[model samples]
Target: ILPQPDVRVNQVGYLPEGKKVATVVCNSTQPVKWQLKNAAGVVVLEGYTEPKGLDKDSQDYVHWLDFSDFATEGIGYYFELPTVNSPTNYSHPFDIRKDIYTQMKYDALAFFYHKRSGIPIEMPYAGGEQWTRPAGHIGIEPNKGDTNVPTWPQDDEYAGIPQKNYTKDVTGGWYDAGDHGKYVVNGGIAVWTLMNMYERAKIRGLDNWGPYRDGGMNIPEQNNGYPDILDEARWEIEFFKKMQVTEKEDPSIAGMVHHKIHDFRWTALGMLPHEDPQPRYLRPVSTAATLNFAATLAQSARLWKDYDPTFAADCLEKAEIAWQAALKHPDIYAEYTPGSGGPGGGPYNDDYVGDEFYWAACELYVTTGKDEYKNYLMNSPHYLEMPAKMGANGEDNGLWGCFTWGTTQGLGTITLALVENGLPATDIQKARNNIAKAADRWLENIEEQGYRLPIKQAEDERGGYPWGSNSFILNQMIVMGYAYDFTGDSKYLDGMFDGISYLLGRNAMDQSYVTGYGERPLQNPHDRFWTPQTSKRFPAPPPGIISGGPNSRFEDPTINAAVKKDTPPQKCFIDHTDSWSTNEITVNWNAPFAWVTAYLDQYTD
Candidate 1:
């Protein structure tokens, strides 16, 4: 209701006043017919898409085709979509929602609330408490009873803690994140929120603070630290880089910078250490977010290349360390990076490590272009398992991209890694062919026609769209675009463009981003620190705001039709809205999006 969808749209050139341009998109089980109709109940454009995506979420298809080439714009026209009962156009006949509008309004106020005071939007955990000083607590705090509550500078301040009635998850750590992968992705959302804050700070003049050079928003410790909002971003970029290279590479470092540091702790004469229980890697310490942080570093390096090279170097250095560590310890790395279930974290580590390693290595090469790093890709054992790994709930072996969204981006990275790195065309083509075929077998939607749920319909009921990834469908475009560039195959280019066109066609969303809350539920629906739970046990969290602030529910297909009706279509203010794709801010989600989006902007022509 407040902020609108954050997506930007533009044409290659100016259009004549009366020219009509059309884009087609779809979610098809097979080659279903599509059509466009005029205002007076006439068909305008029509076609069908042979299901292309091959994965758990492939059945649904979307195509964005330009139709202005066929008619005059002033004539008045609209598009018709395929429904369950009918294969052709809708009988009622509908036209595009035509209107001229231009007003980019992100919830600068929400951002202001968070930045001036570290208070986030009404996060259920904290009842919308700010992560600031006096009003909130950043880090450790003292009790008030004995009159021992620390005051002013001595108060232990961190980010938002369990607010009001909301208690901390049994497992919560700033550095590692909530044990659940859902929580970790929430951190990604936080990062996205911060990105928004950074942007808002820029226009509102929070960049420079008070008389002492830091006095605008009540951002506290970071006061006057960053001269302007851009500087603040620069600091974050630099800080992230420093963590990878120089600093310890974690959020916990802030608490440790002026205090003690602890990566892990061991009991006297104990066989294993006691750090924190997180999924993946049997050992206690969390490796998923750490490994993911490296991925973020790599991505950030690629995206912020122009902003600060030092940070880029830091990201590469850290990523190099992570991969080296993984190569050194395959047993632990492989276990933690893959799926999201199990006894403890259950298949906690999932196959992300294997998949991420491949992409991280490629990103490293992209940043440094070092032949030695290329060996990591060629010599890496884990990288190869990705394609063959398939099946439900850890049923298949090798690398199975179980979740639909990450799988899309992750697989694209692996494919691009091979093709773009000068791997033999035959080998790259072989992998692509294999994936295309695999996608056909796995990506099916039975319960509902024209709907593509991740995994099959039966699996979806049990797993909840196992792969209802996110709006960043732009993920595949980057990878496929690289493939097209690498192979110079018009098919790959078409595929990549097709993905972009499809995303654009799904005008249901104002932008290619969405948000949700993981711990929003009362119970710990899924895994603990690092163990998988029963399939029937874990529950899906509810969706949150989309790219914009205020009220976020954009058009989501999976959320049942009745729910969709309640979520009226909102305007997308910016095509590239500063969005928090994950529940909160974390390196994993942000870095990848940053890297991919910046890269694609280069080929807009």
Candidate 2:
């Protein structure tokens, strides 16, 4: 085997004042020595760290050196490691500056504008790689053949039968992934994450962040004082309201939201959102989707009340109705059956409604200061079970983990604890204590894990890397950021940077998982119109799209056929366009990527 000694640096390849540690690894057990040199080949600092142990899967030795005491104030400073028994020595150059993530924060949010459905991305954005496009999935029909379709009009003529004439103009939302589906359950988490980013930025006094400083999305509120991020959020919120079941359709079924809107088949290769001609159908409604809808709407109402009172009032009223609808049909689940032999998009099925119920109740209670919602939040069985479950399992348990779509009761609890309303102090303190305990456990894992991430899987389980594993890592950083906000602890921030640095290129692969901003950044991702090789006219995906990195099990056939069978878990990524498991970009992934980037850009010592 050819020896390819790997040296990893932070994806941005630059360090600020407090970020003074650089990690290195070798393919063998030989001694590792490193030196820092400034311009003119002068060695300013030299140190050596003994090899701790082999990596979990790659079987390489890990090393860490502290450069905190070194004089890193000049340009052209790099880390040089002398060659031992390997083929070559390594030298990695990085800068120590104040403006590390200034442009990075802007690029992260610009990705949302490029992925916006039902709108045109004109010039001066994404380097003019975008264009105007028509809205998708407009006027969806009720597929009468599917058994999940609800019977409407309740009249003798239409009794126990689906109506064909039912049509709603459910248009305008972001495409879910490389496909053109608009899923409500996924959209719920994406929007909430972005809104939480905006809320935290404002509270942290980072008002000058340029990405949201002006109206760039060309929406109706472009001239308003509110940032463009909220305008972008409102773009999706309006579409979310359209996905609801109006009282005109069925008085009893009012406020129940559909799970998704998608064409019967996946769009052909290299097709944009506007180019597809397939007819779209609305999926059936569910209690889980409705509660997510209610929770997001309630949160938006509180945040937008001062800026847009009329819209805020409408959001709160609809949230009330949606919450009531969720209570009425608490256990209903949506069904999906593809009309053709293609992907049915992604499904948002949950076995229980406890998390959804708790999330909605928390948002509603904090917004309206109502005792009934508070009682539900404090007394819900799911809420009562979470602290105990985390206590027994050390808070970093679960396969897919908490804070994701299926297990968001913990996310809701953290939000309720952080936000200030007229709630009881004891309840807020209890929520804070639960979250802090989990943070303490996560910090320990960051030190012990080989990748220096909080990814802890049992010995008997499968590999650590899953599909969209980058998103999972970034979402955990969101919790750590909130942990810093609640406790003012710097260690929480240390964990957040570890996750950010790992996603940026500080791992065994030494490849930046983002589309831009590293030495060997990704070129082709699993996006419909962004694959330049498949469509010569189309360019590669714009910067800031975070790739779904490193799926160890390698499930997707398209990706599985292209790579070696026994690649290590941390090295199981392909930067090609066909690798959907490891290279596909998604909204949920970018949301937290942007959130954490902005969080670090404004972070102070």
Candidate 3:
């Protein structure tokens, strides 16, 4: 009647060591035992959670379980729990699902699937060269003159719809996907996972499933020891190609599906481009996945400059589209408009919502010397601001929070772009101040500290140390470098080097392979769970969680840390998520390992 407690597993759709499944409730005050049983009433595993040392209270508790050994393809299995001196509370029979494989497959395919559709969705479009546009079999039909109209089929295939929004109602506001264009971050996570799977299958040299180094998705076998890493690249491209086709085939659905479509683009595209595709989502453009894509793209670009230059051009082109669209529909950010068929739906963001596009517009002009980009950056002829409100102390601020830290990195990128293009950078000084302010806020706590924790600031709570050292540190480093480029100060540049040094130091110091601790591999920088790492390296991406404790090896606290409290506070640690009695492994924490090392190369000679 109560739906059997509605126990939900966290890694139900993960691959590899996706054992981080937590029971909805547990009672361990009296030495609870995990006595797993099979359908035939046989015991599978017997373990205990010590009553005295239980971290959580007995009223409610969650226990992470691993049933990988009992999981057979298409087989059914459930769990059983027992309290001290009591009969077991067996769960309703539940099948061990293999949907991770299919989910992995679908995640990989969706990129190309959507690309082939030509639905006119927006994304950054990184990874591989020419599975779409100039090289691929598909093309976007050119819009004759109406930039707002969809040209699903036309002669000038390269022409995209005008970068503009239309007013569909009495109140003014952006009514276009242009408002939600930057979906690259979401896309990268999925595509990169698939790329990792492609690589693993090839290196293992399996006779089935892969040889992925080439630019194709069909499964194949090769004698070469390496799992056709090239095919993995090809599959990455194919994902986008498919996505293009998907959009074209279903033009009517393009606008509605742009958010998801944008996500795929972000992950697949790799580079953040000077301008992000869109930034309406609460999360700003992230270097997390984009950096991974960038490292991949930059490597390939160097080795094969002659090879798909068109694919290399997507980020710049898309930024231009977004810039033009914003300029044409400058009124898209006007007054509040309610959502249809909803009781209290109304303007969801600042009245100057469209101005956010300015960040990306700066990126376009920086990445490419398109004059219009400069025009938008300099004088768009329109601006809006909410009435300023005075605080108790008489400080004036807009409706949004005082700091725009979410857009800090983006603004940093824009500033760098402007400096690179030799544009009048009146705002460059202001942008630098913002970066210093944010970084200082974060650095203040760590004056005598080594590792920047997941939370950056304790006082404000808005800023604090991030989970992993890979992206957060690297992003800060990049910001520092950009700031250095403007001021030509060696210390700022040195901070970049020092942050990187600290990240590597932590990795090397870690005795356990854990990268960080959090719900998923991607959640924190403190430690890295195996899933994201494996997903980053292999062609068929694994689920987010993998075998062992804390999901990540780099960020977790290690056994070495546990017993040897005097051990100089090692840079890396394995979080306490599983029972190995200790942590011991010496492998790089996958994606972070790959990207961070690659980025360090940039600062090196």
Candidate 4:
């Protein structure tokens, strides 16, 4: 047995006030006495643990030690509980302060700058020396580059799918994940999260978008005039624009976006982006990607109008064209394949576009005040509810209970809830009500699961833990923030803290999924450039990069050998570079991490 006591906590610390909870895993039926101590070893507070019985994810007994009454604001405080036969019983030291998440706010948002392609990550904004790197895929030598990228060969299996032969200069964007692929479908929702965070703050009149405004962080974009968040999000939004079909390519498909662009086949695990020698090719276009482009840009247009009206008009025009193209060919689903499916990129095979249409319609409606978009949205099946669509594998109701690239009705819900529109005033209220309902469900999920993470691992209809489970949890936290905005109830704030606790530490692995925040922060993400664990030559990952966290699938070779399908969902993770299914870092995953941290820092009780 492990010598350390089986208690889990947020090693990153908690706010001075709110519902503070630490979970202790033990088989004891009697009350477990716990002590909270300051740095000098003085017992600052003591309490009897509330027995919570079994945690389904860990298959172990658990108890909650609540210390909300200990409101002293300071650092180096820890909790201790006596455990028979254990050599140490002390938890990681943490701090309680006013801006407990302020550092996290800057760190998480800066990750986007570090992942930028086609531009060098320089000393001023790299956050540390480890992240500085040359501009990748910028028509450089030994790299075919994003400039003038060609479409996949018509002779290939995807034959007439792309239906165009000419090449175009599709230059910059954040890489989708550990791989070198740049995917529009995945980038859409990720960029929306950041832009929406700023929009939410602006709607609430949050002091000129305080931390997200100009000069927010160490980014080179600081003092560039626009809010730092928009500048970061614009990097990808512009790349999404570049992927649009040119009028000369094919008149019918012009304005539709390419699903993704990547290498002809899989690259080696440790290959850096600039070092990747394979020729890159654009893949088939799809309705999902096109609508994602339309929705995200339409949303961007709404925010960008105050900053750059001409560009905003251009964005809205492009979005409407893309929206029209999507409506014309609405059934074009991206090819679905696991393990590259013959291309060196994630399949991102989204078969459902009901949510995409809803999201795009909502954005267009909000930005344009056009009755066509509004009539389309309200008449659709997804207007009132977060559209529950068919799962990729024909699994349960396929309720992507939270929004992501595939499940995007929540994005539409947010647009209606936050953005002022011509909708009947009560319609906006209904949107708020739906978000609050999601918050209600997630609080129940926190109750049903053992680690108290927001993911309903034990009872989710989609089996349990999907790939990028941590991203799913962060997205839920964003929704919880919306719920809080609606109801002004502190329970939503409490739920956010529980998610923060689970993410920072209080989980089955006793791991902080974010880098540089805890005693056992995840170090080896499955990134090509940041693979110090696999090769001594590579640089280590910088702080603020969040891992994909646990995945019950365990599809990657590294974790598959160590765990089985029946492994506890929360315990089915390994911090290894080859564990891509479980440990890969992604832009989509970090966007919500950035949003949730900023939101939490602002709403601290």
Query: Which candidate wins on TM-score?
Result: 4
Looking at model 4, residue 231 earns an lDDT score of 87
**Per-candidate TM-score against the hidden true structure:** 0.44, 0.89, 0.36, 0.96
- Between candidates 2 and 4, the one scoring higher on TM-score is 4
lDDT of 2 by residue, 1-605 (tens): 22223455664644454544555776546557787787677887788755657767544577765565553456657667765444445534555665566667667776666677665556554365354344443332322211132323333221222433366666677777888777788788888887778776666665446545556433445567887888777877887898889888766678998777666555556877666665566666778789889988998898899888999999999999999998888877654433246334665556566788998998899889899898888788655222312211122234433476655687578667767766678877877777777667777867775557666542325645666767777777777777788899878887876777777777777777888766667778888788886877877677777888888777677668766777777777888777777888877888888888877777832
lDDT of 4 at 547: 90
Looking at model 4, the pairs that clash are none
RMSD of 3: 17.9
Poorest 10 consecutive residues of model 2 by lDDT? 387-396
lDDT of 4 by residue, 1-605 (tens): 22434667888788888888888876778777888899898988987888888887778788887887778988889878854235456677888887778788888877788778888888978867767788889989778978978888877654337476889788889888888889999899889988899998888877365466888768778898888788888899899999999788889898899999888778877776788898888887889999999998998898899898887888999999999999989999887665655767888886788889999999999999998999999997778564222232222245344677777777897889888899899888988888888788889878776678776652444466777878877888888888888899989989999998999988888888998888888888898888888788887787777898888866788898978778887888998898998999988988899889888888763
Candidate lDDT (C-alpha), each: 0.31, 0.69, 0.30, 0.82
Q: Estimate, for each residue in 274-352, the C-alpha lDDT of model 3 and write its tens digit.
A: 1222211111112222222332232223222333556545533333333343344343221222233211111222223
User: Model 4: number of clashes?
Assistant: 0
Estimate candidate 4's RMSD in Å: 2.1
Model 1 lDDT vs. the true structure?
0.31
How many clashes (backbone atoms < 3 Å, residues ≥3 apart in a chain or on different chains) does model 3 have?
A: 111
| Clash tally for model 1 | 99
Name the top lDDT candidate: 4
